[PDB]
Design a binder for this molecule. Structure first.
Ligand SMILES: *S(=O)(=O)c1ccc(CCN)cc1
Length: 199
């Protein structure tokens, strides 16, 4: 199967999240995502087929993980735009507050907005997660773990949480009322010694 930022994956055949970014660790294939999407060892399926499992995770405190992908599968250094195309990923340079940013995930597809704050703490039900970056692109339950990136292709981070409304998303309110929080990708790559697949 092809691994691509933003696409749906299932965890333990029970819940859903979205791929963050294809990565490698030496010859080992994988992708980064949110830690709250799966406990260690959780079985991951994409496109109706087992592709690997949660290799490591931190959540709460942080909210990060990577899923090691079996060698039979192909990694794509890109993110889906949910209309038949991809956006090439070219690096992980972090963007400043006010910069434009988009995200991609299985519930709301491809959505754009701006970076609006950094080093935010989310008081999730499972506990605090610190150091999150906030944007005002909208998102919904199921987009978690999915890619955040600038249009020029710099990976920002993986979808963590935010102020979803009773319909399960914050797309029904204007961007100015939105709080959509992602875990910065830089520390995930560093902690686990992973390399972005680029194109
Ligand atoms: S994730 O983006 O799919 C996501 C976002 C927000 C929530 C609300 C509970 N913190 C759940 C999952």
């Amino acid at each position: 199967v092809n691994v691509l930022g933003g696409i749906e994956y299932s965890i333990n055949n029970a819940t859903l999240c979205s791929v963050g970014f294809s990565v490698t660790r030496g010859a080992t294939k994988g992708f980064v995502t949110a830690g709250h999407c799966g406990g260690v060892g959780a079985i991951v399926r994409i496109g109706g087929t087992q592709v690997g499992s949660f290799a490591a995770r931190v959540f709460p405190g942080n909210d990060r993980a990577w899923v090691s992908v079996g060698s039979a599968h192909t990694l794509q250094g890109a993110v889906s735009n949910y209309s038949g195309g991809t956006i090439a990923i070219r690096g992980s340079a972090e963007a400043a507050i006010g910069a434009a940013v988009c995200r991609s995930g299985r519930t709301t597809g491809y959505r754009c907005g701006n970076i609006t704050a950094k080093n935010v703490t989310a008081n999730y039900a499972e506990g605090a997660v610190r150091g999150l970056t906030q944007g005002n692109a909208c998102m919904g339950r199921g987009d978690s773990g999915g890619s955040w990136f600038t249009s020029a292709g710099q990976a920002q981070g993986v979808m963590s949480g935010g102020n979803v409304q009773s319909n399960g998303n914050n797309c029904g309110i204007p961007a100015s009322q939105r709080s959509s929080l992602f875990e910065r990708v830089g520390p995930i790559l560093s902690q686990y010694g992973l390399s972005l697949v680029t194109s």
